[PDB]
Subunit: 249 residues, 4 copies
């Protein structure tokens, strides 16, 4: 019987590459999304054509609120309803935008950035654990948390909290055979918004090849961590940054 | 003119010692509290007896909510109203209790993440917007070796490390330094049996005792002083080597 | 076929690394200091699997005036035997207490800093100058929570972290990646077993080798200056 | 009686500032030096004119060799011979220059960079501890150890080892009441050989004031760590870098 995985924010970009690689490795997948309905359904279609009844979508807003625990429980439940098991949780979905110290209200910024990057991962990890082989969770972190982007405090706090979740959950869930690890991209797929000369500015910073990570390269590290080759690894965070975090100002 | 400091959760234990030591250094102080009104007022009266009109109290819940930003703005405002300036913010108030993975969970999130991280962020924003300026965040030396089943508390304290770094970077142009003090084992719970208190004390390499509140306060006093004028984004462990000790 | 140098490859973790590399399709230089019989025994086993794919190399890795020449010749042995050197695994390691309050202190320095840090530095330099190229340094997950009275050992492993970072930075333009694997408790030299969150047991050497294999692979092509803990959560556990 | 301190490489720059500040706080001092004999004696003359019999000089090479243990023993012994006690050791002396991976022999570079930055601190710590109130050791580290200068591998290895010494020595010496801490400057006093325009390049990188640390600012953090205000602090490293280590590439 095939194992099953939940990947949050899996309709596009890095989460999609993670979903695809998991599926190619033999997993059934829940493709979670928020706004990208067309891309999500398109992916599930691609994957089911490849193997029947192996992918479903699940729409959920991961902003912090009094019903976020219910939404997170429902995401996990959807995997069990579709596949009868849930072996892997990948916490990939993430809001990312500046929140200068000196538009959306600050209430909303806190709820979105801390919700998506930290609180939802915590609730999903809770629901995953309580619903329970090679069980594991992989959190998408950030290689640059100690050298943050200017004016991204709430985002950075969110990613720092996710490091703490990775460590605390690895410690507490180890007795249940659940491993909890992280993958920390540096510069990977760049914003569709961002201009090209600015893209090349970031690209030129990366020691290894003067280029951003492909989504597939980020996915490779996720696959390692969920695999039987990582069965003694828990509470570890693998940087996938081409040495970017090593470069001084 | 004497500088002014806001200390959150200053009615007792560590925040109290910090408020006392700031006051003794010559600061006027806003003693923030949540539930401990009598202790907060007792402290203000004691400090005002030392120097008239140098201490005020300020009640506020720092739990995350849609009123938290306004509450934080008012805390900072109260220092300006009382003393006409606000030179130092100390983020000390902190909820701390287990949240096992296996109060409603939404309340635990609001309290643990609100006090430890979001309120410090909102207070930092308000402090900066209103401008030897500095902020000191009370962290935790044991965040990479956390207590079992304290995930939300640990997340909040990591978030606070992130805030200290991000705010240090962003506020350095405005000449505001942002640092942390990270206790290991300090003031134990009042109700904790001495036998359990001794299990903790014996873990600490340096003197097999917990840090006094005054020892934690000493590091805060250093960071706000003219002797730390180039220090920003640094976190000082005050843990007697506890974090160095393997399982 | 690509070729790999594994230092201290005769026994234990270094042996598991060499075998797994060999199973992945590498030709391997099995380096040894004292364990000649074991090194040849491994070489024999690997050459029986595929002819002319494993050779041995003797060198003492203690710090000295001759360490640079020794490290140069280890790298050269790989080029001589296989005509290329794609992977360097710095696994060889001295391990023993050096209390702050038998061997002279200067010998303890030569072994604990020479084998753990200086030899990896000189092997790295030789590897880079002779050029999916990568180096993997065998680190220690307990570097920040060290064994009592192990200062020199801990110093050498910290220096090995510093080498991993500096070399990853400096050698990236050359397409040489440089990473580490940080075991917690693997092969002992029961108290420790019960401390480990994940299964209350030590890592097999094979579990360490798995992480090395990942890092040298096409699946780690963007990973440099990263250190992967393989410690079953041990470093997360407070005193 | 006044306490006594050994400061290594104390003839000029940051070591002098530390010895001066300790002397100003009331310590008697051993001004260790290697080549800077004139500057060392000049410093001692100034300090002794301030308070008679309160400063001595001590010449020693701190390069690694089979006699380094005897040299380190003698430095500590010089403090007991002059002052009857040794309360504080500041490991400040440090060789610093590039050793590219791709002049001096490599054996000499290793001996100098690893000897001065790591092995001598270890031997001095050993001697200090064995010769033995408020006892402590302060190690001069480097805030940039995780974002190192290109081509400084041996220097970087030395400072990492020094971080390890600080942690290991704090653990093992705590039972004896000896505290062990570090001060990690970012950019402080720039090289005498460095041209002004290159100095300004480094200055502009520092968020807090776009300027290097003064020697006094570094000395201030040392004075804190040796003081009664740091009585529970051990195994801590205080960055004094104006935010420099937080700035991404
Ligand atoms: N890209 C990089 O260079 C980089 C660098 C460092 C770290 N990372 C980390 O790696 C992971 C993947 O990065 P990425 O760039 O692929 O991410 P992304 O495109 O910015 O976001 C991934 C997905 O998160 C979902 N999301 C955003 N807000 C949400 C909300 N309120 N509720 C539920 N889902 C929400 C979105 O889903 P919908 O489209 O369906 O609305 C989005 O497609 C992220 O955790 C990120 O922080 C990326
Ligand atoms: N004690 C230790 O060993 C230790 C160890 C590591 C870190 N720390 C850190 O050091 C700091 C001080 O420690 P501590 O033990 O003295 O703290 P504490 O006694 O646990 O709490 C400090 C104050 O926090 C305030 N607080 C709690 N919940 C609040 C809420 N929802 N809204 C507003 N204020 C709230 C309380 O104020 P009221 O009493 O007025 O209700 C309380 O007196 C904390 O940041 C802590 O995490 C302490
Ligand atoms: N075992 C663990 O639980 C553990 C924990 C943390 C870190 N590690 C790291 O994992 C790696 C391998 O561990 P291990 O336990 O297998 O190592 P080990 O058994 O202690 O030694 C590995 C090999 O190092 C070589 N070696 C020692 N001194 C040498 C010298 N002076 N010159 C040349 N070679 C020398 C020896 O080769 P010869 O036999 O040929 O003389 C030895 O077989 C090491 O880097 C270690 O620090 C292991
Ligand atoms: N300057 C900075 O921006 C900076 C940045 C990061 C870290 N740091 C650290 O802060 C400390 C002070 O920096 P600094 O720039 O003042 O240092 P420095 O001038 O480069 O060196 C200080 C002293 O080290 C001594 N020294 C060098 N080689 C020696 C040897 N083989 N044996 C014995 N002593 C030797 C020299 O003594 P003699 O002159 O008598 O020959 C020199 O005066 C150092 O540990 C350094 O690594 C400094
Ligand atoms: N959720 C999430 N998190 C990020 N950290 C993130 N980062 C970038 C980015 C783009 C260029 C340079 C550096 C980062 C991005 N385009 N999207 C992102 N989305
Ligand atoms: N806000 C807050 N944060 C803490 N980290 C904290 N910790 C302890 C404590 C007691 C004994 C042993 C270890 C910790 C405590 N009694 N109160 C605390 N309050
Ligand atoms: N080279 C080397 N380096 C080590 N760090 C090492 N460590 C252990 C060990 C055993 C039990 C608990 C902790 C460590 C060991 N048996 N051999 C080792 N060999
Ligand atoms: N021993 C020692 N260690 C250093 N790290 C050091 N650093 C600088 C230097 C100045 C410009 C920017 C950064 C550092 C220096 N002039 N001397 C130094 N000496």
């Amino acid at each position: 019987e095939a194992p099953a995985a939940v990947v949050t924010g899996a309709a596009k970009r890095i989460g999609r590459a993670i979903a695809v690689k998991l599926h190619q490795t033999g997993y059934r997948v829940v493709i979670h999304y928020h706004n990208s309905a067309e891309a999500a359904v398109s992916l599930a279609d691609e994957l089911n054509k490849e193997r029947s009844n192996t992918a479903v979508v699940c729409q959920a807003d991961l902003t912090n609120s009094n019903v976020l625990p219910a939404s997170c429980e429902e995401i996990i439940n959807s995997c069990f309803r579709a596949f009868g098991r849930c072996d892997v949780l990948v916490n990939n979905a993430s809001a990312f935008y500046p929140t200068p110290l000196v538009g959306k209200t600050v209430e909303t910024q806190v709820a979105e950035l801390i919700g998506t990057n930290a609180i939802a991962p915590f609730l999903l990890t809770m629901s995953f654990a309580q619903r329970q082989s090679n069980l594991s969770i992989v959190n998408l972190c950030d290689a640059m948390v100690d050298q943050p982007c200017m004016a991204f405090s709430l985002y950075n706090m969110g990613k720092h909290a996710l490091v703490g979740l990775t460590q605390s959950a690895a410690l507490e869930l180890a007795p249940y055979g659940i491993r909890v690890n992280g993958v920390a991209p540096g510069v990977s797929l760049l914003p569709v918004a961002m201009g090209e000369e600015e893209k090349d500015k970031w690209r030129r910073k990366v020691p290894l090849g003067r280029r951003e990570a492909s989504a597939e390269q980020i996915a490779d590290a996720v696959i390692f961590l969920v695999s039987g080759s990582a069965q003694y690894i828990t509470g570890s965070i693998i940087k996938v940054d081409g040495g970017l975090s090593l470069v001084h100002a």
